[PDB]
Design an enzyme around this catalytic site. Structure first.
Site, PDB file in Angstrom:
ATOM      1  N   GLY A 121       2.061   6.988   8.262  1.00  9.66           N
ATOM      2  CA  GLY A 121       3.461   7.253   8.326  1.00  9.66           C
ATOM      3  C   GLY A 121       4.446   6.320   8.510  1.00  9.66           C
ATOM      4  O   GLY A 121       5.553   6.512   8.163  1.00  9.66           O
ATOM      5  N   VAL A 178      16.696  17.273   8.347  1.00  6.09           N
ATOM      6  CA  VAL A 178      17.950  17.973   8.360  1.00  6.09           C
ATOM      7  C   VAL A 178      19.140  16.777   7.713  1.00  6.09           C
ATOM      8  O   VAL A 178      19.204  15.787   8.342  1.00  6.09           O
ATOM      9  CB  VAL A 178      18.486  18.226   9.955  1.00  6.09           C
ATOM     10  N   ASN A 217      17.456  12.239  11.891  1.00  6.42           N
ATOM     11  CA  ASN A 217      16.351  13.437  11.629  1.00  6.42           C
ATOM     12  C   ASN A 217      16.125  13.589  10.082  1.00  6.42           C
ATOM     13  O   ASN A 217      17.040  14.000   9.328  1.00  6.42           O
ATOM     14  CB  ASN A 217      17.252  14.622  12.127  1.00  6.42           C
ATOM     15  N   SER A 272       3.681   3.056   7.904  1.00 12.14           N
ATOM     16  CA  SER A 272       3.463   2.116   6.800  1.00 12.14           C
ATOM     17  C   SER A 272       4.512   1.748   6.153  1.00 12.14           C
ATOM     18  O   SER A 272       5.515   2.297   5.788  1.00 12.14           O
ATOM     19  CB  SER A 272       2.514   2.978   5.783  1.00 12.14           C
ATOM     20  N   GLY A 273       4.749   0.593   6.074  1.00 17.96           N
ATOM     21  CA  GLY A 273       5.626  -0.089   5.347  1.00 17.96           C
ATOM     22  C   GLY A 273       7.174  -0.355   6.105  1.00 17.96           C
ATOM     23  O   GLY A 273       8.107  -1.081   5.496  1.00 17.96           O
ATOM     24  N   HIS A 321       0.613  -1.237  -0.037  1.00 24.64           N
ATOM     25  CA  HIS A 321       0.022   0.076   0.043  1.00 24.64           C
ATOM     26  C   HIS A 321       0.652   1.404  -0.099  1.00 24.64           C
ATOM     27  O   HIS A 321       0.352   2.184  -0.150  1.00 24.64           O
ATOM     28  CB  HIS A 321      -0.939  -0.051   1.379  1.00 24.64           C
ATOM     29  N   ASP A 327       0.216  -7.497   1.774  1.00 22.89           N
ATOM     30  CA  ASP A 327       0.731  -6.271   1.798  1.00 22.89           C
ATOM     31  C   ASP A 327       2.181  -5.963   1.903  1.00 22.89           C
ATOM     32  O   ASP A 327       2.835  -5.801   2.913  1.00 22.89           O
ATOM     33  CB  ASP A 327      -0.007  -5.386   3.024  1.00 22.89           C
TER      34      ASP A 327
HETATM   35 CA   LIG Z   1      18.094  14.820   4.744  1.00 19.38          CA
END
Ligand SMILES: [Ca+2]
Length: 223
Positions: free
Chosen positions: A175, A57, A54, A177-178, A40, A84
């Protein structure tokens, strides 16, 4: 990840971020050229970002490599999310080092109660939304099939496991997900779906990676 902790920098060296302009999905590096994620998470254009901590950044350990091949499981059911799982072939091999590393595929299926590590850059709130710069981590056990089916009647196939807490409060979320569920050094789960995030008696549902080892190996062998 809801109710987790900020991972230490590059402590999940197999965790990648799938980017199409911004982070939209996680994934797991399984050899220098191949990432496994959720079907998905399919998009027709994907940049794989490795060595991230991060994601907002540039820290100096990142490798940004385009997805060349994007292969969803042929039996992926978009309605039920059965099968999936998705493989991405990088356009160049990743350079493997201490911050960018592969995770093993499972040598067997994980038993209920096995402790695992879930990670990702997804929402950290069970109500509303907060998307972190820093990779988040959560320790969570594999739940029994009967408990997962009681949580989600008529929706848990043999290709799905529940991982988490029936009391809620700690869970993967949108977010993530996967991304990976790793237990004793083996990729056993892929963040797939759930009813909301961290709700009581609705643990996250994860693709049962141990059912797909042969498909993964054959797909890599043939492409
Ligand atoms: Ca980066």
């Amino acid at each position: 990840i809801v109710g987790g902790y900020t991972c230490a920098a590059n402590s999940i060296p197999y965790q990648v971020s799938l980017n199409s302009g911004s982070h939209f999905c996680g994934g797991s590096l399984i050899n220098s050229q191949w990432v496994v994620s959720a079907a998905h998470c399919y998009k027709s254009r994907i940049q794989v970002r490795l060595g991230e901590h991060n994601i907002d950044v540039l820290e100096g350990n990142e490798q940004f490599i385009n997805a060349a091949k994007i292969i969803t499981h042929p039996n992926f059911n978009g309605n039920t999310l059965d099968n999936d799982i998705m493989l991405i072939k990088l356009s160049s091999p990743a350079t493997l080092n201490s911050r960018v590393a592969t995770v093993s595929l499972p040598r067997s299926c994980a038993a209920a109660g096995t402790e695992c590590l879930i990670s990702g850059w997804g929402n950290t709130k069970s109500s509303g939304s907060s998307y972190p710069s820093l990779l988040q981590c959560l320790k969570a056990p594999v739940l029994s099939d009967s408990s997962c089916k009681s949580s989600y009647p008529g929706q848990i196939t043999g290709n799905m496991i529940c991982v988490g807490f029936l009391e809620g409060g700690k869970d993967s979320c949108q977010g993530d997900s996967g991304g990976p569920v790793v237990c004793n050094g083996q990729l056993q789960g892929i963040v797939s779906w759930g009813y909301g995030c961290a709700q009581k008696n609705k643990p996250g549902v994860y693709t049962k990676v141990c059912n797909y080892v042969n498909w993964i190996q054959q797909t890599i062998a043939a492409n």
